[PDB]
Design a protein around this ligand. Structure first.
Ligand SMILES: *C(=O)[C@@H](NC(=O)/C(=N\OC(C)(C)C(=O)O)c1csc(N)n1)[C@H](C)NS(=O)(=O)O
Ligand SMILES: [Co+2]
Ligand SMILES: [Co+2]
Ligand SMILES: [Co+2]
Length: 448
């Protein structure tokens, strides 16, 4: 009497299957969900329940689309539609593996990474370490990561947030990349004392060098030209404090204190990435705006759905958001090339030279944010969130890559330090080679 609907599949942008159903027998008919890639993109895809409905992930949140509606006899069965993701399984597989060995090598508690298409903001890869296997019973996997931290778990960004100050000061014509500044080792601002991460007297850092060397003091001096109102407006245009609408369950909105509630010291903290929180996806989406010539396109992971007849409907594209002009975006991209620039004499070296890939205009920004100690409500001394966000490449943006490491003891490649730059190096370099992308003078970070 009951006419069962057949569950739809979940496939990547090229129709490579991530989840699909086969008929079997036991209540005799029994549909078996198949995950041919095992843990591959399981943070996104999710898993199935005993009744063949979604248990978590997209299997759950899109269950109505995937499950259809059982018929009867007449009411015809509406079979489940197929969900086409923006993911590229080849990119996802490489990124997910690289994230696992970044976690193992660095000693971090966890690692995650997001790759966006520069122009469209589509999610090409989204991965975390320790990803569970939905072909196995969830109850045996308490030691696994079952969720999707890239969207669910916000963090204080620290210096990766400096993209906002850089964009604001250029967009309003308050500085230029080659302006020679005078940057002291510390300043008193908003009642508090801000110090750079290295001891130094007044240094002739250029604006480029302020972001290339990650001078907090230089960032706040330039932010003082912008002012609180224009700065807060730029934060909002970059999408912070708001869910992206990416189409994934459990997305956090992050947290940004609205300006009418700022303390006297908020403005001394936000421009260097303290006092607010964002997800990895939000962080990566910020750099997508700059990659796409100033136009932020909210990321999406659902590309299309295919009805049981086989007719395909593309997902509606989100509306453009103009953050800065194309000219500003191009200037900020070029400036952030300084971060990955190497200099044997030290003087013109950025914070992340291992992120550079020779032959390509890689551009990005490092972050090292002190974590809050839950036992005191106060900052740890030696526990960090490490971030990197970059663009491949500055002259031809194709890929935007965001990475976060939860308190690594070492570099992402296992060398001493605390940097995610090597993981960006590996991923961005591999993306260039696999598409056979073809290969000026050194940027000045420090004047006389
Ligand atoms: C930016 O990320 C900048 N980091 C900081 O100023 C912060 N902490 O710096 C260290 C780790 C030196 C500290 O112990 O204070 C910071 C900002 S918000 C937060 N919770 N901590 C660094 C120096 N820039 S980077 O490019 O070198 O990463
Ligand atoms: Co009827
Ligand atoms: Co150390
Ligand atoms: Co290499």
């Amino acid at each position: 009497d009951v006419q069962p609907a057949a569950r739809g599949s979940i496939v990547d942008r090229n129709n490579d299957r991530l989840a699909f159903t086969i008929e079997a027998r036991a209540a005799e008919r029994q549909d078996l969900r198949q995950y041919p890639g095992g843990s591959l993109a399981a943070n996104v895809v999710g898993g199935i329940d005993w009744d063949g409905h979604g248990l978590l992930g997209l299997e759950d949140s899109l269950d109505a689309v995937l499950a259809g509606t059982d018929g009867s006899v007449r009411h015809k069965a509406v079979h489940g539609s197929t969900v086409v993701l923006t993911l590229d399984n080849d990119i996802q597989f490489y990124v997910q593996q690289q994230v696992q060995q970044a976690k193992n090598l660095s000693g971090a508690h966890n690692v995650s990474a997001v790759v966006l298409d520069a122009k469209t903001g589509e999610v090409l890869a989204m991965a975390n370490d320790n990803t569970f296997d939905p072909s196995q019973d969830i109850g045996r996997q308490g030691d696994k990561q079952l969720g999707n931290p890239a969207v669910s778990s916000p963090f204080e960004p620290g210096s990766v947030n400096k993209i906002v100050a850089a964009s604001a000061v250029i967009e309003h014509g308050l500085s230029s990349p080659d302006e020679v500044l005078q940057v002291p080792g510390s300043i008193q601002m908003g009642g508090v004392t801000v110090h750079d991460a290295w001891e130094h007297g007044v240094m002739p850092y250029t604006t480029t060098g302020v972001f290339g060397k990650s001078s907090n003091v230089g960032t706040l001096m330039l932010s003082q030209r912008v002012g609180p109102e224009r700065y807060y407006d730029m934060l909002r245009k970059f999408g912070l404090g708001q869910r992206t609408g990416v189409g994934l369950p459990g997305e956090s909105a992050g947290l940004v204190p609205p300006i009418d509630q700022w303390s006297g010291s908020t403005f001394a903290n936000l421009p260097i990435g303290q006092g607010l929180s964002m997800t990895l996806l939000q962080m990566t989406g910020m750099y997508q705006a700059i990659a796409n010539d100033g136009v932020r396109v909210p990321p999406r992971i659902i590309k299309a759905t295919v009805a049981p007849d086989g007719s395909r409907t593309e997902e509606p594209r989100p509306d453009d958001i103009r953050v800065v002009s194309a000219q500003t975006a191009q200037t900020v991209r070029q400036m952030l090339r300084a971060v990955v620039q190497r200099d044997p004499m030290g003087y013109q070296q950025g914070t992340g030279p291992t992120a550079g890939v020779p032959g390509y205009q890689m551009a990005g920004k490092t972050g090292t944010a002190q974590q809050i100690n839950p036992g005191c409500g106060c900052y740890f001394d030696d526990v960090y969130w490490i971030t990197f966000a970059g663009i491949a490449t500055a002259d031809n943006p194709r890929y935007v890559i965001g990475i976060m490491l939860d308190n690594p003891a070492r570099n992402s490649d296992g060398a001493p330090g605390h940097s995610a730059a090597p993981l960006f190096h590996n991923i961005a370099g591999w993306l260039m080679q696999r598409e056979n992308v073809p290969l000026g003078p050194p940027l000045v970070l420090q004047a006389t």
